[PDB]
Design a protein around this ligand. Structure first.
Ligand SMILES: *[C@@H]1O[C@H](CO)[C@@H](O[C@@H]2O[C@H](CO)[C@@H](O[C@@H]3O[C@H](CO[C@H]4O[C@H](CO)[C@@H](O)[C@H](O)[C@@H]4O)[C@@H](O)[C@H](O[C@H]4O[C@H](CO)[C@@H](O)[C@H](O)[C@@H]4O)[C@@H]3O)[C@H](O)[C@H]2NC(C)=O)[C@H](O)[C@H]1NC(C)=O
Ligand SMILES: *[C@@H]1O[C@H](CO)[C@@H](O[C@@H]2O[C@H](CO)[C@@H](O[C@@H]3O[C@H](CO[C@H]4O[C@H](CO)[C@@H](O)[C@H](O)[C@@H]4O)[C@@H](O)[C@H](O[C@H]4O[C@H](CO)[C@@H](O)[C@H](O)[C@@H]4O)[C@@H]3O)[C@H](O)[C@H]2NC(C)=O)[C@H](O)[C@H]1NC(C)=O
Ligand SMILES: CC(=O)N(CCCC[C@H](NC(=O)N[C@@H](CCC(=O)O)C(=O)O)C(=O)O)Cc1ccc(Br)cc1
Ligand SMILES: CC(=O)N(CCCC[C@H](NC(=O)N[C@@H](CCC(=O)O)C(=O)O)C(=O)O)Cc1ccc(Br)cc1
Ligand SMILES: *[C@@H]1O[C@H](CO)[C@@H](O[C@@H]2O[C@H](CO)[C@@H](O)[C@H](O)[C@H]2NC(C)=O)[C@H](O)[C@H]1NC(C)=O
Ligand SMILES: *[C@@H]1O[C@H](CO)[C@@H](O[C@@H]2O[C@H](CO)[C@@H](O)[C@H](O)[C@H]2NC(C)=O)[C@H](O)[C@H]1NC(C)=O
Ligand SMILES: *[C@@H]1O[C@H](CO)[C@@H](O[C@@H]2O[C@H](CO)[C@@H](O)[C@H](O)[C@H]2NC(C)=O)[C@H](O)[C@H]1NC(C)=O
Ligand SMILES: *[C@@H]1O[C@H](CO)[C@@H](O[C@@H]2O[C@H](CO)[C@@H](O)[C@H](O)[C@H]2NC(C)=O)[C@H](O)[C@H]1NC(C)=O
Ligand SMILES: *[C@@H]1O[C@H](CO)[C@@H](O[C@@H]2O[C@H](CO)[C@@H](O)[C@H](O)[C@H]2NC(C)=O)[C@H](O)[C@H]1NC(C)=O
Ligand SMILES: *[C@@H]1O[C@H](CO)[C@@H](O[C@@H]2O[C@H](CO)[C@@H](O)[C@H](O)[C@H]2NC(C)=O)[C@H](O)[C@H]1NC(C)=O
Ligand SMILES: *[C@@H]1O[C@H](CO)[C@@H](O[C@@H]2O[C@H](CO)[C@@H](O)[C@H](O)[C@H]2NC(C)=O)[C@H](O)[C@H]1NC(C)=O
Ligand SMILES: *[C@@H]1O[C@H](CO)[C@@H](O[C@@H]2O[C@H](CO)[C@@H](O)[C@H](O)[C@H]2NC(C)=O)[C@H](O)[C@H]1NC(C)=O
Ligand SMILES: *[C@@H]1O[C@H](CO)[C@@H](O[C@@H]2O[C@H](CO)[C@@H](O)[C@H](O)[C@H]2NC(C)=O)[C@H](O)[C@H]1NC(C)=O
Ligand SMILES: *[C@@H]1O[C@H](CO)[C@@H](O[C@@H]2O[C@H](CO)[C@@H](O)[C@H](O)[C@H]2NC(C)=O)[C@H](O)[C@H]1NC(C)=O
Ligand SMILES: *[C@@H]1O[C@H](CO)[C@@H](O)[C@H](O)[C@H]1NC(C)=O
Ligand SMILES: *[C@@H]1O[C@H](CO)[C@@H](O)[C@H](O)[C@H]1NC(C)=O
Ligand SMILES: [Ca+2]
Ligand SMILES: [Ca+2]
Ligand SMILES: [Cl-]
Ligand SMILES: [Cl-]
Ligand SMILES: [Zn+2]
Ligand SMILES: [Zn+2]
Ligand SMILES: [Zn+2]
Ligand SMILES: [Zn+2]
Lengths: 696, 696
């Protein structure tokens, strides 16, 4: 039989390993020749693997690179202006790669150029609440200072935006071993920890879904009109640079001014973690000086787009997409995902050569420039938005397949909850001590949901990856899955060697997944989802699962507002409309589900009708006006957190209207906007429900 | 057979007459009890006529009414402050209606209150070019003046906006017999001309598609959050009032200052048409004083929504919609359209009772508050936008069925050109001297297209009626049809008794259409369109007709730019991308059409696929970002003219970027924005074409 089991059994751990090795011997930085070569290789192989068509789709987008003859670095500079200490110009290369060229040195992509000098302030994680503590409670003024912040907790773009709004004239990011050195584990190459010389690359934009900074709304094609740099979306206004913890120690050890306000401000280095500003008395006259000379340049990028045409509904698209560009070798990020996609394509291709075709069209993508702000996925979606809107069933992302070796992690729309439960019950656990048990059992045991015993944790989608355009802009049902570390010990730092030169094939093969079994399990989950989405007669979405979470989110946002009982009385703030819409959604979804079960299975229009209702249900949550000042976050139920792009926020319009509201100067106006967002949300929920009513 | 002929033959002229009579004995002003009663009657009858469901959909929207105890009027006031002349408080009621109550006196809906006093300036039609002439050429400054303008040529909202931007502190509108008294024809009741005491009501908003001024984007339902008046969309900032030409003569006869600049500024009254400012020397000290006390109030309105469920594609909607609210009796506007809709419903119902059902769902609508800014259609569409977007095949408007008795008028999307040609070839001409000829022959003969001999004129859609939300906001293929006057003698004033108390059943029965044959022909055209849209196996749209007009519009916009050859050189302004996209659209459409003819007719998915491609083709022309500063005009090919809401403009983004560009102070910036709009247009055309490519 050509069924799911046949697809699944064709997947091999050994193939994934071979592909990972192949994808990680040289760097594949976006906009470089090597990454164009790999794109061409992937195009050739997907064709050999059997896809109907495989094309490259290119765009000319704003990218950012250090100046090869004028290196970025930071100094302590004394009263004379001598540079008495200089941070590193490069990460020490790992064993066996010390003759690789074209390793981009660490840098913060899209930093402007500058050589600002000043006194340091230490801002912990540079979260919103860190700056509130500093300015409101401790009375420390960041204006005209250089801030130094530890990586972790939130997206670095948000740190930078926060620093900028507090009046910083520069930012220094560093990796603290409190957040990037796990107890008992050795540094690379002898373990999976971050060495003192290791540094995390990454962009520092605030794009809010825009894609290419120069072409928001439209694909960056050959005749595109570009904004000038000054009007570009999302660029930082102050220089920024990241460093490792050997260098950070040198910058922090002399800090004076106030003590840290409590122990959550102290990392693990042997320094006091004083907030500053400036250094202690004997060095009070020494300053910190940044030297940043990176340039932004419009550079060509390449996506690979593979098509496996549907036999019955070719005009319905199930998308498996993940990026190919890497900061350096991309041993985990992204090639552990890309190798998984490559084997998925290969298995689908195997079935196709034997005469099978999925019911619906499956599109496979190798995105470029994800690391520079989800640019390749976003431009392609801007180009193809009409097709996607009207034909897009689902998007399954495929970045890193592992960030740990403990259990499964799934983040997805509620419409895929049942599909994920059912699929994982039919998969074998790869976990030691669950031999012969299902993945569902091991995952449920190791990652219990906070809400329902006997069920696993499944998180909402946040952002910081290539599903953003599909989900929060276009309203296409999306999900992602990978192996991860223990939730209980999770410091929300990411894995230690993230975006460092030390992220290699060997890191994976020696320390994460030597048998490639976690990789195989992830290929089965991702591939399994795609198979069912593209092949099930009735789309495998359960609208009732949305009803359930909509109620939970409504309770949650209600409870936030209810911290302000007096204002809710004065301004007549009622959540009744939203709770009513959610009740209605629950009732209508319930009846739709009965019809979906009892409808006449012989009738294909009835079937296409009801599948259209399932497909356009995620779509119904889009507001074409967008969220306030964020036109590309159009989904009313889910946006990336305004304070942390990686985190998903529910009812974001109301959440942001309520955030810090006790500090607004015109409460009448602030509570009015809360009410406005309640109306918008209730209306959208009701409207989404009504798409599931009988159509006539 | 239950076919189109059966539908068509059931329509009766005598039924339309009876309905017109029934709909026009008392006023049906939006937000009044009488208009609620008629809505309930229409709901009851559509149910009796056989529709599956018939509901009222209500909204609470901003409306505008004069103060019943404090009348609006205008004065000439002398140096002492005595009011030496006062305009009328009411139009003399027509014979037999002099005891009707609740005739709203003439007023400009949404005028703010005020009693400004000042000197008059006469601004001809208050078009953009009239103010350019006045300010640029004649050097007359309207700041702090009261302007007086004749009705005609353009939408009155645009006149008011233009006056406001020239710094007027008030506006007076009047009907000139040059534009509202046809040669040789007597005044009402003895003919169809405007009497000296007649006055044209109408709103003066600049909504740009927003709907209810207080709730842009969202339906004005029970829990809606409303903007404050100061943030409301589209309200005028200066008082406005309309008058008849007896009163206008009194205001104009004393005007001094400059002479009119040429004869196109002179109407037909016995006055010099001096521009002013102010009166001639002996009366130089007399002033004009307006008294406006109307109030804006949130008022409930009611649409009637009838459903005739499709037998095969119930989830596909063909909409026949037209308004029910009238300024007074609504003898032409809108009840000549509504009576036509009523008989259409009745015929469809007749077929249904005999067991027939259309292939697709037909929705019938009786919209409210059209006269106050297309409010009822717009709110309903805002409420139902998700359904309409994904399921809306077509919208056929049904306001006034006649504005003349000479020939057919059709304005529609190019996608309906072939459908209209074919349908009219099968209809009988009602025209004297074409007995036994087809409607197509008479229409083609009396209204030849400017472009192709042997073909009739078909115009682009403008706005000022209830198709606006469907077409320019949502991208649903739309059209309208009615009998009209001779194009050759058309002064683009409208019919003389437009929006006056004199627009009655008798006006129609005595002077326009005594046998109700033009009405019947219009019911066949409108009903015929609906039938074919809702019943044809393959949607009756021809994408190739869009290709043809896209080329014509591209030539046109190119030619406007080419008036500025030097700037096009300096700024590298190229239209190549747009011409390329149009070429591509032509080629792809051509191949789609071949497939549509040759595809395998047995296959219903293939059929649903290709019909989806036809349905979503109009949709592809929508840009979700909207046009600049006009977020609800989202169609890239067609918007209402920025200078005249009634007129359609093609490539409006580029057109407006080019308008008056030689006057911009920063040409670099202005030409940049031209280029930006070219890119947007070319991209959108290409994207629309690609929806017609093979799907996979
Ligand atoms: C969740 O789903 C429920 C049940 O479907 C919806 O219930 C609707 O609730 C609204 C309130 O928001 C009701 O609105 C009321 O309608 C009355 C007239 O309704 C009749 O006529 C309509 C057509 O116009 C029919 O469709 C309907 O079935 C009835 O025949 C009005 O008279 C009411 O207005 C009066 O009272 C209000 C309330 O105090 C005053 O503000 C007004 O000034 C006025 O005096 C009112 O507008 C509506 O009828 C309900 N519909 C149905 C079918 O039951 C919820 O709205 C929905 N939740 C959300 C968030 O959408
Ligand atoms: C109307 O339809 C036509 C024909 O389909 C479209 O033609 C495309 O035209 C664009 C130009 O806008 C061409 O773009 C060029 O692509 C070259 C590479 O193309 C190859 O590889 C791609 C995948 O990446 C394949 O899909 C394609 O078939 C080819 O195999 C580039 O090398 C070109 O860039 C170089 O030259 C330009 C031009 O001087 C320089 O600016 C660059 O810096 C660079 O040096 C160029 O980008 C495209 O290939 C054409 N496609 C096809 C299939 O023919 C029109 O674009 C379309 N009109 C509109 C408005 O959409
Ligand atoms: C602090 C940290 O770094 N973490 C790890 C982030 C890993 C991001 C990675 N994505 C990825 O690197 N994308 C690029 C580009 C993203 C863009 O430009 O939007 C990037 O972030 O620089 C991925 O999705 O796998 C831990 C963390 C996870 C979730 C939460 Br809620 C809170 C904290
Ligand atoms: C000058 C004039 O009045 N004309 C007649 C207009 C008749 C408008 C009428 N619509 C209708 O009255 N609508 C209402 C509400 C519209 C709104 O608020 O948007 C209104 O205009 O006050 C209709 O569509 O039949 C002639 C004219 C026709 C076309 C062109 Br291009 C140029 C001139
Ligand atoms: C990764 O695998 C690819 C494909 O097997 C290798 O690329 C091939 O290189 C061989 C030897 O030079 C050529 O003859 C083939 O034409 C190549 N195929 C394609 C599709 O490009 C590539 O050499 C491998 N890379 C590494 C680092 O091992
Ligand atoms: C990278 O830095 C180098 C050298 O430090 C830059 O080269 C100089 O640039 C300017 C041109 O604008 C010249 O005035 C100098 O004479 C150049 N000096 C040398 C030694 O080459 C170079 O411009 C920078 N590269 C980028 C892409 O910005
Ligand atoms: C840090 O790096 C800087 C720049 O390379 C060093 O200062 C330079 O040293 C050379 C050689 O003495 C001088 O000619 C340059 O003029 C100096 N440049 C600047 C900007 O000061 C500095 O010596 C290094 N410091 C340490 C401790 O290694
Ligand atoms: C791969 O799995 C092993 C088994 O859990 C991990 O090793 C253990 O790590 C935990 C701390 O989380 C300790 O409690 C055990 O004592 C460790 N045993 C060892 C190292 O043999 C290992 O950390 C995992 N690898 C990765 C990269 O996460
Ligand atoms: C997940 O599996 C469950 C259990 O098989 C599916 O629910 C069943 O669906 C069948 C077929 O419609 C119904 O007749 C059974 O009553 C259902 N059982 C229960 C407990 O609901 C469910 O549909 C599957 N989910 C998805 C998305 O496929
Ligand atoms: C317009 O026609 C309607 C319907 O025929 C008339 O309304 C009917 O009035 C009669 C007599 O009062 C009642 O018995 C019916 O119940 C009414 N029907 C409905 C559906 O409302 C109405 O009287 C006519 N109006 C005019 C001005 O002639
Ligand atoms: C319409 O005009 C009347 C009378 O010219 C207004 O009535 C007056 O309004 C104010 C209340 O704000 C009172 O101070 C007066 O005493 C009222 N006078 C009389 C004679 O009634 C009325 O307010 C206006 N109506 C609307 C809807 O604005
Ligand atoms: C125009 O109308 C106004 C207002 O009704 C008239 O002036 C009023 O006349 C009465 C009676 O003489 C006075 O008590 C009011 O004080 C006047 N009001 C104002 C605002 O002036 C005026 O007489 C009328 N003019 C003509 C020519 O009919
Ligand atoms: C109804 O049709 C008649 C016939 O054309 C119109 O009457 C003619 O009007 C034209 C001017 O456009 C003259 O050339 C003829 O001399 C007129 N003959 C008449 C009045 O008998 C009449 O105007 C039409 N009615 C309406 C409302 O437009
Ligand atoms: C308008 O009628 C024309 C002529 O019948 C239709 O075009 C014909 O369509 C048939 C059926 O597809 C083709 O085989 C003929 O070749 C066509 N003739 C020509 C000259 O094109 C056309 O499809 C009708 N238009 C609509 C919208 O129905
Ligand atoms: C921070 O410092 C700068 C100038 O040195 C000043 O302009 C700004 O107001 C300060 N803000 C606060 C809150 O102290
Ligand atoms: C028009 O008149 C007013 C003041 O009476 C003045 O402020 C304005 O500048 C004038 N504009 C021109 C162009 O004359
Ligand atoms: Ca873009
Ligand atoms: Ca509204
Ligand atoms: Cl992922
Ligand atoms: Cl109409
Ligand atoms: Zn990645
Ligand atoms: Zn990454
Ligand atoms: Zn009308
Ligand atoms: Zn009207």
């Amino acid at each position: 039989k050509h069924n799911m089991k046949a697809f699944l059994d064709e997947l091999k751990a050994e193939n994934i390993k071979k592909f990972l090795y192949n994808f990680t011997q040289i760097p594949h930085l976006a906009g470089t020749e090597q990454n164009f070569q790999l794109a061409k290789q992937i195009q050739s192989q997907w064709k050999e693997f059997g896809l109907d068509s495989v094309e490259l789709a290119h765009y000319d987008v704003l990218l950012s690179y250090p100046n090869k003859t004028h290196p970025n670095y930071i100094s302590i500079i004394n009263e004379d202006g001598n540079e008495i200490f200089n941070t590193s110009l490069f990460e020490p290369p790992p064993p066996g790669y010390e003759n690789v060229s074209d390793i981009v040195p660490p840098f913060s992509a899209f930093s402007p150029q500058g050589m600002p000098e000043g006194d340091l302030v230490y801002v912990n994680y540079a979260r919103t609440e860190d700056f509130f503590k500093l300015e409101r409670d401790m009375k420390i003024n960041c204006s005209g200072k250089i801030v130094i912040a530890r990586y972790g907790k939130v997206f670095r773009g948000n740190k930078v935006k926060n620093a900028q709004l507090a009046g910083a004239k520069g930012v220094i990011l560093y990796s603290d071993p409190a957040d990037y050195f796990a107890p008992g584990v050795k540094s690379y190459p002898d373990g999976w920890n971050l060495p003192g010389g290791g540094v995390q690359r990454g962009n520092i934009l605030n794009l809010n879904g825009a894609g290419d900074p120069l072409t928001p709304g439209y694909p960056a094609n050959e005749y595109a009109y570009r904004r000038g740099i000054a009007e570009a979306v999302g660029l930082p206004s102050i220089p920024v640079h990241p460093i490792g913890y050997y260098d950070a120690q040198k910058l922090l050890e002399k800090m004076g001014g106030s003590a840290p306000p409590d122990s959550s401000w102290r990392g693990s280095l042997k320094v006091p973690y004083n907030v500053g500003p400036g250094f202690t008395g004997n060095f009070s006259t020494q300053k910190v000086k940044m030297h940043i000379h990176s340039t932004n340049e419009v550079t060509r990028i390449y996506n690979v787009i593979g098509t496996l045409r549907g036999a019955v509904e070719p005009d319905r698209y199930v998308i498996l997409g993940g990026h190919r560009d890497s900061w350096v070798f991309g041993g985990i990020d992204p090639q552990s995902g890309a190798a998984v996609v490559h084997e998925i394509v290969r298995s689908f291709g195997t079935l196709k050569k034997e005469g099978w075709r999925p019911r619906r069209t499956i599109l496979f993508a190798s995105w470029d420039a994800e690391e520079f702000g989800l640019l390749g996925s976003t431009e392609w979606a801007e180009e193809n938005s009409r097709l996607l809107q009207e034909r897009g069933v689902a998007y399954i992302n495929a970045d890193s397949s592992i960030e740990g070796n403990y259990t499964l992690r799934v983040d997805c729309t509620p419409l895929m909850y049942s599909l994920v439960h059912n699929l994982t019950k039919e998969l074998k656990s790869p976990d030691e001590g669950f031999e012969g048990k299902s993945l569902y059992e091991s995952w449920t045991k190791k990652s219990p949901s906070p809400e329902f015993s006997g069920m696993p944790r499944i998180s909402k989608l946040g952002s910081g990856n290539d599903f953003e355009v599909f989900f929060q802009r276009l309203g296409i049902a999306s999900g992602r899955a990978r192996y991860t570390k223990n939730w209980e010990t999770n410091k929300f730092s990411g894995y230690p060697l993230y975006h460092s030169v030390y992220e290699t094939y060997e890191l994976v093969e020696k320390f994460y997944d030597p048998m490639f079994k976690y990789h195989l399990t992830v290929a089965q989950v991702r591939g399994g989802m795609v198979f069912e989405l593209a092949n099930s007669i009735v789309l495998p979405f359960d609208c009732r699962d949305y009803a359930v979470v909509l109620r939970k989110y409504a309770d949650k946002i209600y409870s936030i507002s209810m911290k302000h009982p007096q204002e809710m009385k004065t301004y007549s703030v009622s959540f009744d409309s939203l709770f009513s819409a959610v009740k209605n959604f629950t009732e209508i979804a319930s009846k739709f589900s009965e019809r979906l079960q009892d409808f006449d299975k012989s009738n294909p229009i009835v079937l296409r009708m009801m599948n259209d209702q399932l497909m356009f249900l995620e779509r119904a949550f889009i507001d074409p006006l967008g969220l306030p000042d964020r036109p590309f976050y159009r989904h009313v139920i889910y946006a990336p957190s305004s304070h942390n792009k990686y985190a998903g926020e529910s009812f974001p319009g109301i959440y942001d209207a309520l955030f810090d509201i006790e500090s607004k100067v015109d409460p009448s106006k602030a509570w009015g906007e809360v009410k406005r967002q309640i109306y918008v949300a209730a209306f959208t929920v009701q409207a989404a429900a009504e798409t599931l009513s009988e159509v006539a």
